[PDB]
Amino acid sequence: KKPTFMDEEVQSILTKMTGLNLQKTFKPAIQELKPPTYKLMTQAQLEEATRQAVEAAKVRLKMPPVLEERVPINDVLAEDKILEGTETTKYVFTDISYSIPHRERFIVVREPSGTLRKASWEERDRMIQVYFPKEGRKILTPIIFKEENLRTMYSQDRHVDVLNLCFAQFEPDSTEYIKVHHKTYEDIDKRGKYDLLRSTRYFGGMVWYFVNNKKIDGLLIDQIQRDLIDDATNLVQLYHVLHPDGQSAQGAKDQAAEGINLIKVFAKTEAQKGAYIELTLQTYQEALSRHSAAS
Amino acid sequence: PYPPLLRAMIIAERQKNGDTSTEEPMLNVQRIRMEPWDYPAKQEDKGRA
Amino acid sequence: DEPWKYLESEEYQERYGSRPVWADYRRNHKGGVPPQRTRKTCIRRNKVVGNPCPICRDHKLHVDFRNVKLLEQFVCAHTGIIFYAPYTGVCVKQHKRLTQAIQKARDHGLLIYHIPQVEPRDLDFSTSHGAVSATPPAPTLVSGDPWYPWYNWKQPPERELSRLRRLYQGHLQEESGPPPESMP
Amino acid sequence: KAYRGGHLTIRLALGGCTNRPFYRIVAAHNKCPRDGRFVEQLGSYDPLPNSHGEKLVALNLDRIRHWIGCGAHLSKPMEKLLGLAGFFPLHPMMITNAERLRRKRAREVLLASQKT
Amino acid sequence: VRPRLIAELARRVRALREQLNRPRDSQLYAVDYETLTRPFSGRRLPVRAW
Amino acid sequence: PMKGRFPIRRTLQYLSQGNVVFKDSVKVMTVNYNTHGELGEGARKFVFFNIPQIQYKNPWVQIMMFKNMTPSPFLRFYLDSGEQVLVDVETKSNKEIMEHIRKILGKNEETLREEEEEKKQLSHPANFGPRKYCLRECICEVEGQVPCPSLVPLPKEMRGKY
Amino acid sequence: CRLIGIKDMYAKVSGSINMLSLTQGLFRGLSRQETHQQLADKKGLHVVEIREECGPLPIVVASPRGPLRKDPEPEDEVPDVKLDWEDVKTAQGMKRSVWSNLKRAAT
Amino acid sequence: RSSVHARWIVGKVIGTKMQKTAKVRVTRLVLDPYLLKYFNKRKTYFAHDALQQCTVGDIVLLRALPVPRAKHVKHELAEIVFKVGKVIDPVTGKPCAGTTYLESPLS
Amino acid sequence: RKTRHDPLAKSKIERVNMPPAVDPAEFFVLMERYQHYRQTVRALRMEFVSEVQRKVHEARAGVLAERKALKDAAEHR
RNA sequence: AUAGGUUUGGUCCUAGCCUUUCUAUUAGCUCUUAGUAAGAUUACACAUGCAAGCAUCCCCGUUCCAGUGAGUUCACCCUCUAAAUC
Ligand SMILES: [Zn+2]
Ligand SMILES: [Zn+2]
């Protein structure tokens, strides 16, 4: 069985890929300001406070679930030809309730054809947002999710906030969420600010999308430039698990490769700029020789 | 038959609570009588003005 | 006519400086507490009042969604709140226009503002509900018989029709007639 | 109050402005004012078209079932809308007006055919 | 609470007068047959019964 | 400055900062305590600091305090079934007494959250009433829908100018 | 405070508003402030800040210049501090005033 | 069950000058909301006692009645919690006067 | 609106309450539709009445209610 | 209250009154359009028009809505329980 996104080993290695920068996770944001409080402790209680900040960072950095797209639903419950031609503009009925889940509530549409069709996904989301509003979501689609707006704001280097607005507006199984997330990932593969997407809860989804649709050359490049070498080896490991029928994979288990040699096997096998991966690897090994002589 | 939205309700909740049970949802109707627009009432449930 | 030129030009840094536009206006009022609203407009008809607001005192200062340095001048820097009209000095009309410029730039992307990280709407993310999956179709629907067959017109026997006529003769209206089927 | 004689009634209550109707589905006593004490509000009904156009309505179906089981007497637009929903059977009155419109439109088609 | 003795007395004697001097069916359901107007009521009958 | 030794005991967050929410079985709480003696210091501080919090979180339980009539401080609880709980508090602390009574006759956290969940069941979002009770008054506010005539003029489909 | 350079405080005066006592009391308080470095040197422990804007991240502001004391601070439950009735009134919301939060000009 | 609001109340006997009835003072704690401070508020209840067991000054527990007997008698005696003078310490179930043991607990 | 002691107007002292003219088959099929609709809404209302009664009875005394009552008593003791 | 004016030949303190803010009614002067909210001072007297009918006779309803602020702790909770809807 192919391990999906929600498995323990892939979740642990994706957590290690993300990493925990406290000064980036808990960052001063421009909200309403209250006077700060001051506390008075020792080194041990300071370490306890940093540990609690780390745990709160893990809670904040809990990973949103990456899910497949939904089938556009078209199910006619009933069709009343006697009702056809009586009214003009349709009627959307919603079972609001209070304890039923939102993906469990029933919303239907009656049309001037007499058709009692179950509501589509977009009408479903709009009616759920109307009657059970959640903060940040507007039933009219924001104009910021248009081509020129996303381009300008990518140029302003705001990809974490792309994914924030997209999470707030669209459900993760929706086609709009899917399209905006992959368009942002394509833009960041074109230019590349993986550090701008590090220590955020979209790094794992970015890595999952790239290794699923293979464009991880820049990930290896930035990892071994920024000395994330265990991270790079674990990413080649994730590649070898996700694509076990690749020649990288049989070459790796034939040569019993473990580390930088796994990275080399990948770059010899399927890296599209594998000369540049080898060049960066050998410059990094020259740096290793330099600081090993320093050590 | 049940009205279609309620039919959807009850077939949905049964295939959430387990057993598929794809029989058509019917309810008893012969319990209800069919007194037409002729039936006399009671005068003490009524009352003279 | 097209903004984002005066703000980077020379006359801006000559008249003003690194200080904001509204850092020179003092509204005249009965002393103590100023009125908790400004004027509605400086420009009545095509004439300007004696003490113009910071926006109204320079015709070159155009306001729109692309005039980002003015917009971030008129919104606060440490808080994501817009400056109110008694704080700044602009009119009620100008305050409304500057606000509309602020949110227009905000949903056009040419302005910095903070957006909180949102928790997922639901807990279970399955799509195996009868509302979001298929349903077993009705016997009428796999056939074409109308739902609740008492909707269809069915002519009574003429004995019952004549009983009705005996009951409600005299004021009797016109006769019967089956429905058509297809609308024009 | 007391309201000597009466029952609960699921009905529509107007809450809009002039030339803008809006109705709220409420559970009120029959002998109380239209916009007055409702024991609980069951839902909402906007007959006006949206910019897209869908004439909104929301129904708290479990509490509707609860108050019908407690003995609420439904009002004529209310069983019209529940029949339009599919929570109730379609109403004989409004399918009969559909039939009346069938025959009226048939008459005008015949008259226009004679005209042309 | 100051008692409503005179209201209770009026209620009692109204009930007694209604019980004793109730109108009978003879003067209740009589019909002036040419104008369909009942005495003591003043209301005529619906169109389904002329 | 507010009058009294410890003004924090009258600041409405200390009172809604106490922790004991008594079960619906108890009706009377009686605190017999000793003003002197080093062993009843916990009972004295419990009377001084925690009785206002207990009474604020349990508004219908009759709390009666008794002075130097018995040589040992103790708490008595009179419960509607007919029960009489005795908790000696000699050689204890006020925090110990609070933890003890919260364990013995204190409602559980899950019970409190369930009650609060029932209150949030009562508070419903989809209803449209006045701002005192509901969140929105009309769907004149929700965007897309036709606005209120006061804010935006309606087109000439309106009556009068038909 | 425009002459000093201080930009963000709140100040309420009461009793006699005499200018010549107001200014001298202002200077006395501002010159008898205690700073975080002096505080940390007095107590022997770390001074940290907890902002609601950043979150649970502890931001150390002042550390002692000598040794670090190792016994923790005594957690004095229900502390003995003199509160102000206007502060408590504002916190609980029975401070009903038509003058307090008025929209005024800049600074 | 009972129509009496006060189910279980603990109070003090004021007078025994009515036959088979005791006048009891119940003191609850009522929050003065401006001062936010609890003050004792006193109410007089009439309890039914069949044996004339209670004298004045006693601390008594009163249970509710299913239906009130008299106009004001809505409670009955449950126990003499603390008889005057002769106070049996319940923790160590021994007679005592006050703060001292009349009979030693180490008997 | 009016009360029991308001004198009647003259235009209602005389005014005929003429009956609507009756169409035969629409009337008969209308009676049949009415009796069918009343029968099925009586069935739905009876189902809802039984549902409410079942909810009340299981809330008062079901199996989980007795279970939590005995847990409360045992924890108390 | 971010406070200000005012006792005195002058200062400091205590103190009252007033100013600066917002809302509502009325008066003066003066008034272009459109939409929407709201609209006797008087529990003083009322011309007039209408506001309760329905319906195979019986019933039902007119004991509701609508209005007013005179009087005033009959409004809230619990127990018990009669009309009433199922
Ligand atoms: Zn201006
Ligand atoms: Zn509106």
- Strand A115-118 and strand D8-14: the pairing is unpaired
User: What's the rounded Cα separation, in Å, for the pair I30 and D99?
Assistant: 11
Contact residues, chain D, for I53 at CB < 8 Å: 69
Phi-psi region of D60 (alpha: psi -120 to 50; beta: other; left: phi over 0): beta
Q: Could you identify the residue written with the tokens 């001292």?
A: H100
Q: How would DSSP label each residue in G71-84?
A: SPP---SS------
Classify residue C119 by its DSSP letter.
P
**Under 8 Å between Cβ of A84 and G88:** no
Out of F124, F125, F143, the one facing A139 most closely (by C-beta) is F143
Residue A257, classed as helix, strand or coil, is coil
Residue D29, classed as helix, strand or coil, is strand
The two tokens of residue D66 are 């609860």
Residue C65: closest CA among C12, C8, C108, C9: C108
The two tokens of residue H42 are 């006193």
Contact residues, chain C, for B8 at CB < 8 Å: 130-131, 135
Cα separations in angstroms, A21 against A18, A229, C114, G55, H21 = 9, 18, 19, 14, 76
Q: Could you identify the residue written with the tokens 């057993």?
A: B19
Classify residue G18 by its DSSP letter.
-
Instruction: Identify which ligand lies nearest to the alpha carbon of D17.
Output: 2
What phi, psi does D103 have (nearest 5°)? Answer: -70, -35
Quick check: I28 and C177 CB within 8 A? no
User: What's the rounded Cα separation, in Å, for the pair A200 and A198?
Assistant: 5
Which of chain J's bases lie under 7 Å from a protein CB? Answer: 1-4, 12-14, 19-22, 34-37, 49-66, 77-80, 83-86
Residue G82, min C-alpha distance to chain F (Å):
6
Helices (H), C89-135: 92-108
Is strand J in 7 Å reach of the CB of G16?
yes
Which nt is closest to the CA of D31, judged by C1'?
A: J64
Residue A137: closest CA among A173, A100, A164: A164
Alpha-carbon radius of gyration of chain G = 19
User: What's the rounded Cα separation, in Å, for the pair H87 and H78?
Assistant: 17
Q: Could you identify the residue written with the tokens 């709980």?
A: F85
User: What's the rounded Cα separation, in Å, for the pair H30 and F56?
Assistant: 10
Q: Could you say which residues 46-105 of protein chain H have a Cβ atom less than 7 A away from any atom in strand J?
A: none
User: What's the rounded Cα separation, in Å, for the pair D59 and F25?
Assistant: 40
The two tokens of residue G62 are 């002042």
Residue-number span of the structural domain to which H59 is assigned: 1-107
User: What's the rounded Cα separation, in Å, for the pair C25 and C47?
Assistant: 19
**Under 8 Å between Cβ of G29 and G4:** no
Classify residue F148 by its DSSP letter.
-
Q: How many Å is the maximal CA-CA distance in chain C?
A: 103
| Ligand 2 centroid, distance to A89 Cα (angstroms) | 21
Residue C93: closest CA among C36, C147, C136, C39: C39
Cα separations in angstroms, H1 against D83, E14, H4 = 46, 40, 9
Contact residues, chain D, for A116 at CB < 8 Å: 86
Is strand J in 7 Å reach of the CB of G97?
yes
**Under 8 Å between Cβ of F32 and F74:** yes
Q: Where are the beta strands (DSSP E) in chain C?
A: 43-44, 47-48
Cα separations in angstroms, A69 against A121, A123, A169 = 11, 16, 16
Classify residue A9 by its DSSP letter.
H
The two tokens of residue G30 are 């501002």
The two tokens of residue H43 are 């109410």
Quick check: A106 and B9 CB within 8 A? yes
Residue A92: closest CA among C9, I21, F141, D85: D85
Tell me the residue type at A103.
R
Quick check: I16 and E47 CB within 8 A? yes
Helices (H), B1-49: 4-16
- Strand G46-50 and strand A37-41: the pairing is antiparallel
- Strand D8-14 and strand D73-74: the pairing is parallel
Measure the N-to-C terminal CA separation of chain G; round to a whole number of Å. 11
Residue I17, min C-alpha distance to chain E (Å):
7
Q: How would DSSP label each residue in H39-84?
A: EEEEEEEEEE-SS----TT-EEEEEE-SS-SSSSEEEEEEEEEE-S
Residue B10: closest CA among D65, D82, F158: D65
Chain mean position to CA I70: 39
Q: What share of chain I is helix, strand, coil (3-state, %, to 5)?
A: 65, 0, 35
Question: Which residue on chain G is closest to F3 by alpha carbon?
Answer: G82
Classify residue A67 by its DSSP letter.
-
User: What's the rounded Cα separation, in Å, for the pair F18 and F94?
Assistant: 12
Q: Any idea of the CA torsion for A152, A154, A158, A159, to the nearest 10 degrees?
A: 140
Is strand J in 7 Å reach of the CB of D4?
yes
Tell me the residue type at D75.
S
Residue-number span of the structural domain to which B3 is assigned: 1-34
Go through A55-94 and write b for each residue having 16 or more CB atoms within 10 A of its CB, e for each that does not.
ebbeeebebbebbeebeebebbbbbbbbbbbbbeebbbbb
Beta carbons within 10 angstroms of residue H73's beta carbon: 17
The two tokens of residue H97 are 């006067």
**Under 8 Å between Cβ of C73 and C116:** no
Number of domains observed in the structure of chain H:
1
User: What's the rounded Cα separation, in Å, for the pair A73 and A68?
Assistant: 15
Cα separations in angstroms, I49 against D66, D69, D90, I41, I55 = 8, 4, 21, 12, 10
Classify residue A191 by its DSSP letter.
S
**Under 8 Å between Cβ of H39 and H30:** yes
Q: Where are the beta strands (DSSP E) in E1-50?
A: none
Alpha-carbon radius of gyration of chain H = 16
Is strand J in 7 Å reach of the CB of E22?
no
| Ligand 2 centroid, distance to D22 Cα (angstroms) | 9
Tell me the resolution in Å. Answer: 3.3
Q: With touching defined as 3+ CB pairs under 8 A, do chains F and H touch? A: yes
- Ranges of each domain in chain F: 1-162
| Ligand 2 centroid, distance to D50 Cα (angstroms) | 14
**Under 8 Å between Cβ of A235 and A11:** no
User: What's the rounded Cα separation, in Å, for the pair A232 and A267?
Assistant: 12
Measure the N-to-C terminal CA separation of chain H; round to a whole number of Å. 46
Beta carbons within 10 angstroms of residue A245's beta carbon: 6
| Ligand 1 centroid, distance to A279 Cα (angstroms) | 63
Is strand J in 7 Å reach of the CB of G18?
yes
The CA-CA-CA angle for residues C161, C166, C172, to 5°, reads 80
Residue to substitute from F5, F8, F10, F44, interface G, most G β-carbons within 10 A: F8
User: What's the rounded Cα separation, in Å, for the pair A169 and C118?
Assistant: 10
Quick check: A140 and F126 CB within 8 A? no
Q: Could you say which residues 83-112 of protein chain D have a Cβ atom less than 7 A away from any atom in strand J?
A: none
Residue to substitute from I27, I46, I50, interface B, most B β-carbons within 10 A: I46
Classify residue C151 by its DSSP letter.
G
Chain mean position to CA I41: 9
**Under 8 Å between Cβ of I22 and E50:** no
User: What's the rounded Cα separation, in Å, for the pair F53 and A281?
Assistant: 67
Name, in order, each residue with C-beta under 8 angstroms of F136's C-beta and a sequence gap of 6 or more: F128, F142
Classify residue C8 by its DSSP letter.
T
B5 CB within 8 Å of a chain A CB: yes
Measure the N-to-C terminal CA separation of chain F; round to a whole number of Å. 69
Which nt is closest to the CA of G86, judged by C1'?
A: J1
Quick check: I29 and C156 CB within 8 A? yes
**Under 8 Å between Cβ of A174 and A70:** yes
Residue C101: closest CA among C71, C79, C57, C73: C71
Which nt is closest to the CA of E45, judged by C1'?
A: J57
Chain mean position to CA H80: 7
Quick check: I26 and D96 CB within 8 A? yes
User: What's the rounded Cα separation, in Å, for the pair I29 and C154?
Assistant: 7
Helices (H), chain C: 10-15, 68-74, 85-88, 92-108, 139-142, 158-167
Tell me the residue type at A270.
E
Residue H13, classed as helix, strand or coil, is strand
**Under 8 Å between Cβ of D45 and D57:** yes
Tell me the residue type at B17.
N
**Under 8 Å between Cβ of A182 and A209:** yes
